[PDB]
Symmetry: C5
Subunit: 103 residues, 5 copies
Amino acid sequence: TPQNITDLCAEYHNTQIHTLNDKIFSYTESLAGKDEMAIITFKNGATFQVEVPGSQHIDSQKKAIERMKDTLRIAYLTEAKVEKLCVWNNKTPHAIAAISMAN
Amino acid sequence: TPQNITDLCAEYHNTQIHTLNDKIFSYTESLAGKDEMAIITFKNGATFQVEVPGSQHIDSQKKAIERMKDTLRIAYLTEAKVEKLCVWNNKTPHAIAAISMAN
Amino acid sequence: TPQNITDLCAEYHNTQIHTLNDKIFSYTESLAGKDEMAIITFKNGATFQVEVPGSQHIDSQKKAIERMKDTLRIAYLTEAKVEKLCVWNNKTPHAIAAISMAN
Amino acid sequence: TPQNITDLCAEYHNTQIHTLNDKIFSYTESLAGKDEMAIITFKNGATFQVEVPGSQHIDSQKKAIERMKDTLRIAYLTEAKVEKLCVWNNKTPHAIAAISMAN
Amino acid sequence: TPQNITDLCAEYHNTQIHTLNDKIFSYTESLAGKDEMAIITFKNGATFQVEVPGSQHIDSQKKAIERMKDTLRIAYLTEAKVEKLCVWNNKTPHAIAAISMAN
């Protein structure tokens, strides 16, 4: 199994790593339908989203996606420092595939 | 995909942004019949609610409503500054469609 | 729609508002069969309980009841000042129907 | 309904109240199959457990059991003072039936 | 029956207890399909993971798995000291079986 975020991020297509080593700057949640979306930004301006559960989301991928939203909401409120983000760049804002937080 | 709440907001009907830049002043929760609701108010007098889960709402929308209540509860408790709120102005208290928090 | 716990409490059957403006003094949780219950008391001796999840009431009513127990546990742990409680008087200890928190 | 934990602990067979008035010293979680367990200890050496949600547990029972493990984890992590524990003294360690926390 | 992470760890196969007595150094969460994994690291470099679901793990095993992920997440966010880890040494990185936390 991959030991970290980088080697984990190289296993998929259309993914790229971003080293933020910074705390989330803003958190946006929308419950307005078809856009069950969470959007975060950092101070430099970089925006990322947690992609809405469309049909390309199994039922094992719905749970992991909800978890990701929880992780971001709490990482935001606790001001936790996010290290790197492995993101799908074929979408805009870049959809988050993985996250690592390090003190 | 909208990069923020202002855009995310203008995407629906009867929606309206509301800048707050204030923490939630009060949080009310009620489990009394068909009105399982949460009400939040700010120091300036503004009172918003999270709609009641029912009829129109399917599945992904029924649990986004649950996440929204969780988000408001932990935001009230942690005294997080809510920047803006996209609210459905056709309801009273104005229902919440989206929220953004910053820093 | 009522815009606060007092008004909201006025729409139901034999409910009563108790103003506390204090934090919860103790929280008791019991998983002992049939009487799955949560009890809270304030330093002033007042005692309240969240009603146990009957099947005869809808499932959204069971999710509300579960949320309420989370809210009380987290309110107790963080020492949130509870403003008012809207409870049903036809029970003993009195069953909570709504709660407001504010500083 | 019982209004305190000592009353309540008395409605059952083979129960026994312990007063700790102390925080949880350690917390042990395990997912190693059929042994889905939580184990808490206090400085005085006492050890308690939350029973595995077996396939003889009623509907609500499994869910109250999940709640009790969430409570112990959060109590441990926040160093919340545990007042008394109502345990069944016929298991090793004593299975927890109810918990009370007071400042 | 067993009362601590050690006894409990010695009742399964391919398990070894790891004494860490330190806080988790980094936390990595991944929602990228079939790689829905949680990987933690400690200061010395030691890496562990929580085994992704599947039909090998009964639904109750899926739940202890989800619970273990939440525990790892708040422990990291709160900087709780993790004492010992009981891990399956037959995989790489070693898969976590039980965790003990002690202040």
